[PDB]
Symmetry: D2
Subunit: 292 residues, 4 copies
């Protein structure tokens, strides 16, 4: 069945001003590409093609100019705005008619993932046609996120949002898969102590016992881009991987062509406008080179 | 006699595409603040308050949104567009009416400077009220820049642009001081074989007239640019190591304007409030009570 | 059956002098621990307990003081020297009587690995009781390594050592698994144009059609520490992972305790001498915390 | 009148264990060269040629292997051990016969300095032939250091060691100049509550006598230390960005000795050969033909 994807690329507030005064976080580069390329590549990796990008009233035309209607990468892109940063769950209100009758999946515009068999870890998430699937990852600072609590035997029992006293060190990453049940669950939500919390959306699935909570192991890197210090670290992290390997991370053109969403000829047409820099040359090398 | 400044912050073309497809280079951060804060701070260190910012038609409003007219920082900022990226020396045809009969200074919107007595090094560039004054810095890769050539005694004898076999390793920094002759030198230049009004031709004109002062910017200075993705990241790591070590900032324009006495403590306090939550407003607040030597 | 491990921690020559004038590369720290901890942790991860450390005549007592007889981490450590840097295959001459009759495995002292299911990728290597198993990894600069060549259909056909003209971009990592056949193959080896080449040891297995060449995917990081620039990159790479996660990479004490090679009580005894710094505090946290 | 120098490069204890279980801190690299090259270079910048190096009994031979007696670099190096790590001011009881009736200078073997006119800033510290001279640098974390306190006019009025509530953000750098009184001040000190002969007591003695010169090391200077794993890595990224930008090196002792004229071109050429293969020997070779300002 049909599964659609949202990228919530909204306002980081004033938290990183003045770095973000001119233009929103998710259009900043992480090393060699816009930050958005990374969650865009995430959805593409779970095999999602029809995608809704949400952002500030101001930055939406810029995400638009950046991406187009997607048709160039064998994707289908539709855009929507969020008036005020009133919580991540608000993505499910804004995208209701986009979501329609289908299965959905929400990724944060400022979250990076990297690792082996990542395709498969998402592939097994996208496959469950019922309930919701989220990921837990061990971190040093669990307070900054939705913390998940497991019982003596591996089962999820509590989910607290930014708790002052973490129970475990297990944070909920910014990737989520939901069934047809999500939108309605989101309509019945009340503001928190003042946002529509993604964690309530998840605990509503936990109480109905339909939150599947799979561990994303220490062999995976989950980076968020929350501080100037960490945004820097993620640029160094990508830079080291890409220069070591001669291969890119979250290059969508490559992700499309590999999922066979565009033929060798279309990819080449995408290589043309960027032939002079290394980014194009990279796409061009993808026509002749075998990469396992 | 007063000096005006020009920041060139136009189109870097397609070189750093796709990072720069959505916004222009000079809005990307270097650590905790927009890249343009760094050359804007450089002009301020030179005591210059009237600055023209030249960018693309497409990005000009985003610069306006970030920097305004300068009144917040005791400056006056004007804006101009460069529709076609036809080379650096063109900032002088676009900036003509801005410049008038005044002295000027050009800065690249994508160069950072750091180090000791940087202020005094700019003051003596700014005090020479006739001719041009540029700066020479030893680099690894002078192939990429305007290269200077010195005789046995340290007089500059030639300037070449991007030679394959540079005569020295001394590159011309993206900082230039000019008298009133610069506009007329720029109006008379013919397009490079490329079709770019090259600033090295402008400086070369002044050199032929014995009016080019070339001062050495020591290896004790950091002159970084951000010409590649790797070097942008390198420049971010650099500032963060200085700021995290020191609890002082590099190229905080509120602090510098305060330190020039272009704004007072009351105005600084007002500038801090809408940012009191983050480290930056907290940093502007702390400047009010602390003596920093 | 019994499988033993070598760590070849010998001379990098004069390549990184003066940084390495005082003491050999593999005792330099990568971020928070000696470089050797990393290949040591690699062998431990393929379930290897009996290990031979080879190094310069000069640095052997220092590797010794660093590690002891291993008995503290439930390992069994024996030491051996290499007079001159006359090739990596020389490890199989020096360690003959150590190797004895058993299965073996050689890792380079200056190679870092990181990734998900790394235990398993080694577990499937250590398991094949016949022939040799090596890994290929895509890289930008294949010239610096043994390059492997694959045919139109995924099979390894040539192995060239530092070729001037790489065929593929696939380099041989510094992890190798060999059967009882290795030692003898190494005795019959002649010096190259002037070293005993590890690649000849491997091509000898390729000609007998007994080199198993498994792709280590782009989801894995293989770092070597060959330039001052790269040694730096690997320190930043570890630092980012460890500070993000609150978990260490290649902490042997943790690898032992998890493989149950030491009981909660012994680990605690190891936590004592380092209680004041973060490294001990980390071991101490391992007694009470559940890490999936 | 001549000045001797002392580098303290002893046991950092167990703090950076396990990185430092096999070798002492001051042998670890900062980028492309051993950490001790950096303070050794600092002494050389001060014009000091006779250096005592104080390390553990265990590591002393490895320093000897790396640095020798100095003759290669126009210096004379001697060695001494500190069996027990009893604090910095103890370098003066151990170094007594080395010091004699001469002036001295202490440097921490784990501090880096960079920036413009660093040489001249050391010269004026070295020219004051009476009293002590230290340096104050604004930091984020003065809790960790000896903190200076200034009155309204910039005279130093107190010194505190690791206060929980520092009076300023000005920390005392690990660089100190002393006259002949320092040994006698050190012999009379009583163990800190910890049991460490604290250098801040030594400097405090001189302050009480109106003989402490405290000079500001500007924010245009980088004074980095390597007190944590993260900051060691940060200091490596820092040097590499300067050296990779410039094609010049920071704290290359062959270059500095050559530049002081402590060795000549023939001697430099000899020092380059056993390293002609790597970038370092290539860098020593290139110093023979290039003019660097
Ligand atoms: C979007 C974050 C995860 C990217 S990743 O799967 O770990 N990764 C390194 C990666 C991978 N693995 N691949 C290979 C791949 C291509 C298509 C489907 C699955 C895997 C890419 O073409 N681009 C990539 O960035
Ligand atoms: C970005 C322009 C060069 C920066 S700098 O002169 O080296 N520097 C560290 C600096 C300094 N020195 N100062 C202090 C200062 C401010 C105004 C006039 C002289 C000195 C600042 O307020 N901000 C600064 O960024
Ligand atoms: C030795 C390089 C590979 C280390 S790793 O397997 O990727 N890794 C991150 C790691 C892992 N995965 N683990 C968990 C683990 C412990 C024991 C057996 C398998 C896996 C650790 O205890 N320490 C580690 O460093
Ligand atoms: C590590 C001591 C401080 C280094 S420094 O004075 O800022 N500096 C960059 C430096 C400089 N300036 N020089 C040039 C120089 C050498 C000798 C005397 C004056 C200047 C060097 O040869 N090596 C150096 O590391
Ligand atoms: Cl894992
Ligand atoms: Cl200088
Ligand atoms: Cl993979
Ligand atoms: Cl300064």
């Amino acid at each position: 069945m049909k599964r659609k994807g949202i990228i919530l690329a909204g306002g980081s507030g004033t938290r990183l001003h003045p770095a973000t005064l001119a233009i929103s976080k998710q259009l900043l580069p992480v090393y060699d590409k816009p930050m958005i390329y990374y969650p865009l590549s995430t959805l593409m990796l779970a095999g999602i093609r029809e995608i809704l990008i949400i952002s500030t009233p101001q930055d939406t035309p810029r995400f638009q100019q950046l991406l187009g209607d997607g048709s160039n990468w064998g994707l289908d892109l539709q855009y929507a705005v969020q008036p005020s940063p009133d919580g991540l769950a608000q993505a499910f209100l804004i995208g209701e008619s986009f979501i329609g009758n289908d299965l959905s999946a929400l990724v944060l515009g400022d979250n990076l993932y990297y690792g082996h068999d990542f395709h498969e870890l998402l592939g097994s998430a996208s496959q469950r046609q019922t309930g919701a699937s989220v990921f837990a990852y061990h971190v040093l600072d669990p307070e900054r996120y939705g913390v998940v609590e497991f019982d003596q035997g591996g089962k999820a029992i509590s989910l607290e949002e930014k708790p002052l006293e973490p129970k475990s060190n297990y944070a909920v990453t910014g990737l989520y898969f939901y069934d047809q049940q999500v939108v309605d669950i989101a309509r019945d939500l009340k503001p928190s102590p003042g946002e529509l919390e993604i964690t309530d959306v998840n605990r509503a699935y936990l109480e109905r016992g339909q939150l599947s909570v799979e561990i994303m192991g220490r062999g995976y890197a989950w980076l968020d881009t929350g501080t100037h210090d960490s945004l820097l670290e993620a640029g160094q992290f990508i830079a080291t991987l890409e220069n070591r390997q001669g291969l890119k991370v979250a290059c969508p053109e490559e992700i499309a062509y590999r999922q066979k969403w565009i033929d060798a000829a279309q990819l080449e047409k995408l290589a043309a406008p960027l032939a002079k820099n290394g980014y194009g040359q990279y796409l061009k090398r993808l026509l002749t080179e075998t990469v396992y």
